[PDB]
Assembly symmetry: C2
Homo-oligomer: 122 residues x 2
C-alpha cells in the first residue's frame, strides 16, 4: 500500500444538518496532517434534493461549483438566511459560524459542488 | 456585484511547465486572502494530452481525482521521476519542491483532476 495515495474515498463523515454522512475527499488526518478538509459530490442525482439543513462550521469555508459545460450547473446557497445564486463555474465564501446550505437547481452529469473547509474542525 | 461570489472563473495563470495557462478556481487574493490555491479541470479532452512537464511548487500540494462513475478516470502521476497510478476517486500527496505532473490515461465526461496548493505561492 502506497502511503502517498488514498484510494479509500469518499470518507463518509457525520455532519450537522445532513441526513446521510457527507462525502469527504480530504480529511485533516491525511498525510500526517492537512490544514484543510474537503467534502462534496456529483450533482446530477441531487437536483431538488438538498443534502442538508442550514448548518455551521467554526472555520471559514468555500463552495466550489464546476461542470463540464459552462453554466451546466446552477445552485442556490443560503447564507445568513438569504439565497445567493451560483452559475457554474463559481466560488462562494462562507464565513466561520455562518448558517449555510446549498440546493441544486440544475445539473448535468459531471457537475460537482465541493465544500472546502479552511481548517481542521467541523 | 455580490462580493461573496466569484463568477469570473477559471482564472488562467501562467505556471511553470505548462503549455497554456493553468485554470485556477481558488486564488490566494480572493475574499481578502486565502491560505490555499486550487487549479484543475475536466479530463475528457485531456486523455493522452498532458498539461505540463514535470514542475515544482514551494508549498505542499494534493492531487484530487473524481469522476461520476467509480473508477471512471485513471491518471498517472509522476513524482520524483516515478509513476504512481490513481484510479478515481483518489488523492495523492505532492511534497513541496518535488518534481511532479500528471497524465490522463482514461476519463469520462465529468472526470476532474485538481491540484490543491497548501499555501499562497506558486
Amino acid at each position: 500500500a502506497d502511503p502517498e495515495i488514498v484510494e479509500g474515498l469518499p470518507i463518509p463523515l457525520a455532519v450537522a444538518g445532513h441526513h446521510q454522512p457527507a462525502p469527504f475527499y480530504l480529511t485533516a488526518d491525511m498525510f500526517g496532517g492537512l490544514p484543510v478538509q474537503l467534502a462534496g459530490g456529483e450533482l446530477s442525482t441531487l437536483v431538488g434534493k438538498p443534502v442538508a439543513a442550514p448548518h455551521t462550521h467554526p472555520v471559514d469555508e468555500l463552495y466550489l461549483l464546476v461542470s463540464p459545460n459552462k453554466g451546466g450547473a446552477r445552485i442556490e446557497v443560503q447564507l445568513d438566511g438569504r439565497r445567493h445564486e451560483l452559475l457554474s463555474p463559481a466560488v462562494m465564501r462562507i464565513p466561520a459560524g455562518s448558517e449555510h446550505c446549498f440546493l441544486t437547481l440544475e445539473a448535468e452529469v459531471g457537475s460537482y459542488c465541493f465544500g472546502i473547509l479552511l481548517g481542521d474542525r467541523l
